[PDB]
RNA sequence: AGAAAUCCGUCUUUCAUUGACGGAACAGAGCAA
DNA sequence: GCCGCTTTCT
DNA sequence: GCTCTGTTGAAAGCGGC
């Protein structure tokens, strides 16, 4: 069909005094109505029966537990706002058996036995339903009749069956003329029988169209009047009559649709308790308005049904946990362990975890919530806009036009403005380009704003320049006549608003037509994050003459590889925000020198000299952000054991280190080193507070006390937390953008990554890509492969398993204890799982470099101090075998930057001969990316 | 319909009134250290 | 034709 | 910060301006 995504915009409304009063009054009215609907629907759902759940689950192609579905609606935890019939924790099972008329199964019994959070209490909603029948003044069975009708019309969400939308309002409380269900049902059954037994199934639809028209006794131009009475959205039959008489015919689909229609319209909607319900609602909320009652019902109904479903699934999950508890419960080895064979002990560990988890589990209470309300057709259309344009200042106002309820009770529409530079740039500004047309005016969708000149004078407040600049750019795009017009064919836009006046603007758009299972010409790719939180991508193409992959079942071709990178320029100098590690050691001499000045005068409490570790830090000549991380750790050490006066002196030092010249608050990229430096600095302040207040086990320190002692430093605590939040969000968005633009520049249509082994950043990037890719008709899949770091591309599972260890390149000089340590470990590693490959890499290293006498020496060696070969013998031999004392040597280390690939699967790879085997020196991150691209899970 | 407004953010010993750039969002509940 | 209302829609 | 379960309606006619 047609695939569709959603972009959205967010801002805050700016009403004048009177319209703000009206808006607040209207939102409060809707919130009170939603609360009433929550309390009411709680009882309504408590009134359901096993018959209703049986009807709403009958066609569900996997069997459902009806008793549990009745439970999660009859008894639920609630806040004391909705608590009306408190039931004790121990009469849940008894009174459920009373209601249902049978023994409660184990799933429901687990649902009742689970803990509930503090301030949440169990509510018996069936007793509430009985009191609802009393308060309405109607019989219990009459309201049950209307409840069955409502659940059959999909006016309510019953277990697996979703609700129509807010159509309950129109169906039950509506004032217009309803359909004529008898005619629809009769025509539908007649055509169903006339189609179920045919002598010849056609290949087109014209014969079936004529059959339908003959049965209903109408023409192609009168069927809507005859069948639907010219009322409502077009039916399936109406769209079937309307279509071309040459299209393929799908008998099974039409039969299924007719059966659905017959099941839905078998019984009419003759009510019993309609008018009492309407009077109840109108007396309790407001006079009848379809939109307002719809909003109240939507809020309440969603809040209830999400918890109903969640608790249903939670009971079954808890039952499985309970069963797996009572399987590993060997009960004497358990007691010995808590006071000897292999898997009994491991199962006992699983048992401890499981029992702890089972004990702690809380059930999900039903809370009304704090969602906003949506106005339909609220934004004034861009071509309908009222623009007080100026020759040097465009009108940056977007106007809503919302109905508000006045204190008299009458509704009236009003205009309320708001500002969003993004919504103005992408959609709402008046475009005039003669030719150009794009969905959204933003670089990822193909449009770049013109850059600014010395002819553009931006003279505004300082806190507006970033906004003003964009306006200037947009205005320039109009002056040159190059601002594209939005091709979204927008007819109406809704707006969601909360009690704080925040507005959310959703925009839905078609992204293209759905894909079809990787034909020839379709390019795909993969990405992977390495150990240092850096991502790499590898592109591939399906080709005609090429190399076959058993997993994919087609011929594939490597295109290129690369690293995911987001570059910002600064007076011509480029910076990769995702990886920039700061200045080089000979560039921040003054910063390090001031730090040395401070650190010389102090000690660490065993006493040391505290300048000792500082010089240790400087030994390796690290870059600025690595230096800053380690020096934050140093300051944290220097704080651990000091006095109040000493702390004051230290505090003067901390404030400079954080706030001045290179501190994390002024300098720092989006790299892992900066993100860890921020955490280290926060730890500095946390230790300062722990020492100043002299905390202990039995001395808690509430943040109230921390702010009371030092407000100006708790300020930095929140400020650094905010910096961390913003940095991480920016980093995830930039990674997703970089990958998406890499795909766009290359006609990539499929991405493969890791997800649904979970980093915070890997998980976040996977979710962000899953969000962004559909917007460009790019298909994302998720492979949970764990061996991607060692698989050999185009060889692993083509047709058989093939892994190789990961290698590293070292010049002859920098060979030391860390080399022979890995050599001896991997040679000794014969069980590590990924240790066979590293052993075999060590042996290949020995065979290639002709050092087999040293393997006999090294099998015992690599000790802490004594039974080692000296750490220059191997230097001398390898130089003697290469002829130079600075020469690249390949060593199989765990986590190296080099992989030995069979095929050229990384950009810039070169071929060499290792152990009399030809091989390509590839970038191991690119190899992992390629392995991810070629996985089929 | 009311001349104002950074929609939310990032980089740089460079902090910029022509520096270069990034982003579907929201609610509740549960969980994990 | 615009606006606000109704209804049904698989 | 994880997930979990959801939302941000679609499509037609009618009658009064």
**Count of other CB atoms within 10 angstroms of residue A336:** 12
Residue partners of A363: CB distance under 8 A and separation at least 6: A77, A111, A114, A115, A116, A311, A314
- Within A834-883, strands assigned E span none
Reduced 3-state DSSP string for A128-146 = HHHHHHHHHCCCHHHHHHH
| Dihedral sign from CA coordinates of A442, A446, A452, A456 | negative
Rounded CA–C1' distance between A506 and B25, in angstroms:
8
Rounded CA–C1' distance between A235 and D1, in angstroms:
46
The reply to whether the CB atom of residue A509 sits less than 7 A from any atom in nucleic acid chain C is: no
Q: Which of residues 841-870 of A touch strand B (CB under 7 A)?
A: none
Nearest one of A417, A469, A463, A421 to A442, comparing CA atoms: A421
Nearest one of A813, A828, A802, A786 to A917, comparing CA atoms: A802
CA distance A793 to A931: 6
The reply to whether the CB atom of residue A506 sits less than 7 A from any atom in nucleic acid chain B is: yes
Give nearest nucleotide to A376 (CA–C1').
D9
Rounded CA–C1' distance between A507 and D11, in angstroms:
19
Nearest one of A138, A142, A156, A152 to A268, comparing CA atoms: A152
Residue partners of A407: CB distance under 8 A and separation at least 6: A25
Reduced 3-state DSSP string for A508-560 = EEEEEECCCCCCCCCEEEEEEECCCCCEEEEEEEEECCCEEECCCCEEEEEEE
Reduced 3-state DSSP string for A898-920 = EEEECCCCCCCCEEEEECCEEEE
CA distance A905 to A760: 28
Contact A321, A355 (CB under 8 A): no
Report resolution in angstroms.
3.2
**Count of other CB atoms within 10 angstroms of residue A600:** 11
Encoded tokens for A797: 């599972």
Helix axes A106-113, A290-325, angle to 10 degrees: 100
Nucleotides of D under 7 A from a protein CB: 1-14
Rounded CA–C1' distance between A493 and B30, in angstroms:
34
Contact A438, A417 (CB under 8 A): no
* DSSP state string for A307-363: HHHHHHHHHHHHHHHHHHHTTS--SSHHHHHH---HHHHHHHHHHHHHHHHHHH-B-
CA distance A504 to A500: 12
Encoded tokens for A937: 């899970």
Contact A32, A544 (CB under 8 A): no
Which protein residue has its CA closest to C1' of B15?
A666
| Dihedral sign from CA coordinates of A594, A597, A600, A602 | negative
Which protein residue has its CA closest to C1' of D12?
A233
For residue A668, give the DSSP letter. Answer: -
CA distance A931 to A927: 6
CA distance A690 to A487: 59
Residue with tokens 């769209």: A239
> Phi and psi (nearest 5°) for A855?
-75, -40
Q: With left for phi above 0 and alpha for psi between -120 and 50, is residue A365 left, alpha or beta?
A: beta
Question: SS3 of A504, please?
Answer: strand
Rounded CA–C1' distance between A419 and B4, in angstroms:
9
The tally of CA atoms less than 13 A away on the side-chain side of residue A370 is 3
Rounded CA–C1' distance between A386 and B2, in angstroms:
12
Identify the H or E element spanning A805: none
The reply to whether the CB atom of residue A659 sits less than 7 A from any atom in nucleic acid chain B is: no
The tally of CA atoms less than 13 A away on the side-chain side of residue A269 is 20
The tally of CA atoms less than 13 A away on the side-chain side of residue A423 is 25
Contact A438, A448 (CB under 8 A): no
Q: Using CA atoms of A31, A33, A34, A35 in order, give the dihedral in degrees to the nearest 10.
A: 90
Question: SS3 of A286, please?
Answer: coil
Total residues found in chain A within this entry = 937
> Phi and psi (nearest 5°) for A514?
-65, 150
Which protein residue has its CA closest to C1' of C7?
A232
Instruction: Specify burial of residue A82 (Cβ count, 10 A radius: 0-12, 13-18, 19+).
Output: buried
Nearest one of A370, A121, A168, A204 to A278, comparing CA atoms: A168
* Angle ∠(A281,A282,A283) on CA atoms, nearest 5: 95
The reply to whether the CB atom of residue A725 sits less than 7 A from any atom in nucleic acid chain D is: yes
**Count of other CB atoms within 10 angstroms of residue A684:** 24
Residue partners of A696: CB distance under 8 A and separation at least 6: none
CA distance A714 to A651: 13
Which protein residue has its CA closest to C1' of D13?
A231
The reply to whether the CB atom of residue A310 sits less than 7 A from any atom in nucleic acid chain D is: yes
CA distance A643 to A603: 13
Residue partners of A632: CB distance under 8 A and separation at least 6: A657, A677, A680, A681, A683, A684
Helix axes A140-152, A50-57, angle to 10 degrees: 10
For residue A776, give the DSSP letter. Answer: G
> Phi and psi (nearest 5°) for A868?
-110, 145
CA distance A610 to A636: 11
Instruction: Specify burial of residue A152 (Cβ count, 10 A radius: 0-12, 13-18, 19+).
Output: buried
Nearest one of A87, A85, A75 to A128, comparing CA atoms: A85
The reply to whether the CB atom of residue A399 sits less than 7 A from any atom in nucleic acid chain C is: no
The reply to whether the CB atom of residue A324 sits less than 7 A from any atom in nucleic acid chain C is: no
β-pair partners for A751: A525, A780
CA distance A315 to A672: 41
Nearest one of A318, A321, A317, A314 to A365, comparing CA atoms: A314
Residue with tokens 């004078």: A457
The reply to whether the CB atom of residue A772 sits less than 7 A from any atom in nucleic acid chain B is: yes
The reply to whether the CB atom of residue A236 sits less than 7 A from any atom in nucleic acid chain D is: no
Rounded CA–C1' distance between A715 and B10, in angstroms:
22
Question: SS3 of A442, please?
Answer: coil
Encoded tokens for A342: 């292999």
Rounded CA–C1' distance between A628 and D4, in angstroms:
40
For residue A573, give the DSSP letter. Answer: E
Give nearest nucleotide to A269 (CA–C1').
C8
CA distance A560 to A933: 12
* Angle ∠(A623,A626,A632) on CA atoms, nearest 5: 130
Residue with tokens 């001896």: A824
The tally of CA atoms less than 13 A away on the side-chain side of residue A404 is 22
Instruction: Specify burial of residue A845 (Cβ count, 10 A radius: 0-12, 13-18, 19+).
Output: buried
Rounded CA–C1' distance between A504 and C4, in angstroms:
24
Contact A482, A436 (CB under 8 A): yes
Instruction: Specify burial of residue A157 (Cβ count, 10 A radius: 0-12, 13-18, 19+).
Output: buried
β-pair partners for A513: A2
Query: Kind of pairing, strands A779-782 and A748-753?
Result: parallel
> Phi and psi (nearest 5°) for A21?
-60, -45
Give nearest nucleotide to A225 (CA–C1').
D13
Question: SS3 of A410, please?
Answer: coil
Encoded tokens for A659: 């706030």
CA distance A64 to A58: 9
* Angle ∠(A161,A166,A168) on CA atoms, nearest 5: 80
The tally of CA atoms less than 13 A away on the side-chain side of residue A51 is 7
CA distance A723 to A285: 45
Residue partners of A67: CB distance under 8 A and separation at least 6: A50, A100, A102, A104, A105, A107, A108
Rounded CA–C1' distance between A233 and C9, in angstroms:
5
β-pair partners for A528: A536
Contact A710, A692 (CB under 8 A): yes
Determination approach: X-ray
Instruction: Specify burial of residue A606 (Cβ count, 10 A radius: 0-12, 13-18, 19+).
Output: exposed
Rounded CA–C1' distance between A280 and B8, in angstroms:
44
Question: SS3 of A599, please?
Answer: helix
Query: Kind of pairing, strands A806-811 and A898-901?
Result: antiparallel
CA distance A181 to A548: 59
Encoded tokens for A75: 């008894």
Rounded CA–C1' distance between A651 and B6, in angstroms:
34
Identify the H or E element spanning A423: helix A421-423
Residue with tokens 């006609």: A747
CA distance A625 to A672: 10
Reduced 3-state DSSP string for A32-86 = HHHHHHHHHHHHHHHCCCHHHHHHHHCCCCCCCCHHHHHHHHHEEEEECCCCCCE
CA distance A405 to A31: 13
CA distance A173 to A281: 10
Reduced 3-state DSSP string for A655-686 = HHHHHCCCCCCCCCCCCHHHHHHHHHHHHHHH
Instruction: Specify burial of residue A922 (Cβ count, 10 A radius: 0-12, 13-18, 19+).
Output: buried
Question: SS3 of A562, please?
Answer: strand
Q: Which of residues 101-130 of A touch strand B (CB under 7 A)?
A: 117, 120
The reply to whether the CB atom of residue A236 sits less than 7 A from any atom in nucleic acid chain C is: yes
Contact A537, A531 (CB under 8 A): no
CA distance A398 to A112: 51
CA distance A601 to A597: 7
> Phi and psi (nearest 5°) for A70?
-70, -35
CA distance A928 to A529: 9
β-pair partners for A123: A76, A86
For residue A416, give the DSSP letter. Answer: E
CA distance A496 to A492: 14
β-pair partners for A911: A920
Q: Which of residues 357-376 of A touch strand B (CB under 7 A)?
A: 357, 360-365, 367, 369-372
Residue partners of A703: CB distance under 8 A and separation at least 6: A714
- Within A825-909, strands assigned E span 888-891, 898-901
CA distance A204 to A209: 10
Q: With left for phi above 0 and alpha for psi between -120 and 50, is residue A34 left, alpha or beta?
A: alpha
Contact A68, A109 (CB under 8 A): no
β-pair partners for A910: A921
CA distance A69 to A847: 67
The reply to whether the CB atom of residue A568 sits less than 7 A from any atom in nucleic acid chain C is: no
Give the domain ranges of chain A: 17-177+272-316, 181-264, 326-360, 379-492, 574-730
> Phi and psi (nearest 5°) for A656?
-65, -50
| Dihedral sign from CA coordinates of A197, A203, A207, A209 | positive
Q: What is each CA distance from A710 to A434, A543, A705, A717, in whole angstroms? A: 61, 66, 9, 11
CA distance A870 to A259: 84
Residue with tokens 């459920």: A96
Residue with tokens 């870059």: A623
Nucleotides of C under 7 A from a protein CB: 4-10
Which protein residue has its CA closest to C1' of D6?
A306
Give nearest nucleotide to A166 (CA–C1').
D9
Sheet hosting strand A898-901, strand order edge to edge = A888-891, A806-811, A898-901, A917-923, A910-914
The reply to whether the CB atom of residue A756 sits less than 7 A from any atom in nucleic acid chain D is: yes
Which protein residue has its CA closest to C1' of B30?
A364
The reply to whether the CB atom of residue A553 sits less than 7 A from any atom in nucleic acid chain C is: no
The reply to whether the CB atom of residue A719 sits less than 7 A from any atom in nucleic acid chain B is: no
Residue partners of A744: CB distance under 8 A and separation at least 6: A444, A776
**Count of other CB atoms within 10 angstroms of residue A89:** 12
């Amino acid at each position: 069909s047609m695939s569709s995504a959603i972009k959205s915009y967010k801002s805050v409304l700016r009403p004048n005094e009177r319209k703000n009063q009206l808006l607040k009054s209207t939102i409060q009215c809707l919130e009170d109505g939603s609360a009433f609907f929550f309390k009411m629907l709680q009882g309504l759902f408590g009134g359901i029966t096993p018959e209703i759940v049986r009807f709403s689950t009958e066609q569900e192609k996997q069997q459902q537990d009806i008793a549990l579905w009745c439970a999660v609606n009859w008894f639920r935890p609630v806040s004391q706002d909705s608590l009306t019939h408190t039931i004790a924790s121990d009469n849940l099972v008894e009174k459920f058996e009373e209601y249902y008329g049978g023994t409660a199964s184990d799933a429901i019994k687990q649902y009742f036995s689970a803990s509930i959070g503090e301030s949440y209490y169990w509510n018996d909603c069936r007793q509430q339903y009985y009191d609802l029948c009393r308060e309405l003044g109607v019989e219990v069975s009459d309201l049950t009749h209307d409840l069955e009708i409502l659940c059959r019309e999909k006016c309510l969400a019953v277990a697996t069956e979703s609700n129509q939308n807010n159509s309950i309002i129109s169906v039950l409380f509506g004032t217009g003329e309803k359909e004529d269900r008898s005619v629809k049902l009769r025509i539908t059954k007649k055509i169903l029988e006339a189609i179920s037994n045919l002598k010849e199934i056609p290949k087109n639809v014209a014969p079936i169209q004529e059959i339908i028209l003959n049965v209903a006794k109408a023409t192609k131009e009168t069927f809507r009047q005859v069948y639907a009475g010219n009322l409502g959205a077009p039916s399936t039959l109406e769209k079937f009559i309307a279509k071309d008489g040459q299209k393929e015919f799908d008998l099974k689909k039409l039969q299924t649709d007719l059966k659905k229609v017959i099941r839905g319209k078998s019984k009419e909607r003759d009510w019993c308790c309609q008018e009492e319900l309407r009077s109840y609602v109108e007396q309790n909320t407001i006079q009848y308005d379809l939109w307002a009652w719809g909003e109240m019902f939507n809020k309440a109904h969603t809040a209830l049904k999400i918890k109903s479903t969640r608790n249903y699934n939670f009971a079954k999950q808890r039952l499985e946990q309970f069963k797996e508890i009572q399987s590993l419960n060997n009960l004497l080895v358990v007691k010995k362990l808590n006071d000897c064979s292999a898997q009994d002990i491991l199962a006992a560990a699983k048992y401890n975890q499981q029992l702890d988890r089972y004990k702690s589990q809380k059930a999900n209470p039903s809370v009304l919530g704090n969602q906003g309300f949506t106005w339909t057709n609220a934004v004034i259309l861009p071509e309908k806009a009222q623009r007080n344009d100026r020759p040097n200042s465009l009108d940056l106002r977007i106007w809503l036009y919302l109905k508000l309820r006045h204190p008299d009770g009458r509704w009236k529409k009003h205009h309320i403005p708001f500002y969003d530079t993004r919504f103005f740039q992408e959609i709402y500004a008046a475009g005039n380009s003669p030719v150009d047309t794009c969905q959204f005016r933003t670089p990822r969708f193909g449009y770049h704003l013109p850059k600014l000149t010395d002819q553009t004078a931006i003279r505004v407040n300082k806190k507006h320049v970033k906004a003003a600049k964009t306006e200037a750019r947009i205005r320039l795009a109009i002056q040159q006549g190059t601002l594209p017009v939005s091709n979204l064919k927008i007819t109406e836009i809704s707006a969601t608003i909360n009690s704080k006046g925040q507005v959310r603007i959703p925009v839905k758009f078609d992204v293209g037509r759905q894909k079809g299972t990787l034909q020839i010409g379709d390019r795909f790719c993969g990405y992977d994050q390495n150990q240092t939180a850096s991502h790499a991508y590898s592109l591939w193409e399906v080709v005609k003459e090429g190399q076959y992959h058993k997993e994919l079942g087609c011929f594939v071709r490597f295109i290129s590889s690369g690293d995911i990178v987001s570059i910002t320029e600064n007076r011509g100098n480029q910076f990769d925000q995702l990886s920039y590690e700061g200045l080089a050691y000979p560039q921040y001499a003054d910063w390090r020198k001031k730090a040395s000045k401070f650190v010389s005068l102090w000690q660490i409490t065993v006493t040391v000299e505290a300048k000792e570790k500082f010089d240790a830090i400087c030994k390796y000549q690290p870059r600025l952000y690595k230096f800053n991380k380690e020096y934050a750790y140093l300051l944290r050490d220097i704080v651990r054991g000091k006095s109040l006066v000493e702390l004051q002196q230290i505090r003067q030092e901390i404030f400079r280190f954080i706030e001045q010249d290179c501190g994390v608050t002024r300098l720092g990229s989006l790299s892992l080193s900066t993100l860890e430096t921020v955490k280290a600095v926060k730890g500095i302040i946390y230790s300062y507070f722990s020492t100043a207040l002299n905390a202990s086990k039995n001395n808690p320190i509430s943040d109230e006390q921390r702010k009371e002692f030092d407000p100006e430093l708790f300020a930095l605590l929140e400020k650094l937390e905010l910096i961390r939040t913003r940095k991480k969000k920016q980093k995830v968005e930039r990674i997703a953008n970089s990958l998406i633009q890499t795909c766009l520049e290359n006609n990539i249509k499929f991405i493969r990554g890791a997800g649904d082994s979970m980093d915070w950043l890997a998980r976040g990037v996977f979710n962000k890509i899953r969000q962004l890719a559909p917007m460009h008709n790019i298909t994302l899949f998720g492979c949970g492969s764990l061996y991607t770091s060692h698989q050999d591309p185009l060889v692993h599972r083509n047709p058989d398993k093939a892994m190789k260890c990961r290698w590293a390149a070292i010049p002859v000089k920098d060979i030391g204890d860390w080399v022979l340590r890995k050599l001896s470990q991997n040679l000794r590693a014969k069980n590590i799982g990924t240790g066979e490959y590293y052993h075999q890499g060590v042996k290949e290293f020995l065979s290639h470099y002709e050092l087999q006498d040293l393997e006999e020496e090294l099998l015992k060696w690599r000790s802490d101090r004594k039974s080692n070969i000296p750490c220059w013998v191997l230097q001398n031999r390898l130089a003697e075998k290469l002829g130079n004392k600075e020469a690249v040597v390949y060593i199989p280390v765990r986590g190296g930057r080099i992989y030995f690939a069979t095929h050229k699967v990384a950009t810039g790879a070169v071929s060499i001969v290792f152990d009399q085997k030809q091989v390509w020196v590839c970038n191991a991150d690119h190899v992992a990316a390629a392995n991810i691209a070629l996985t089929v899970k």
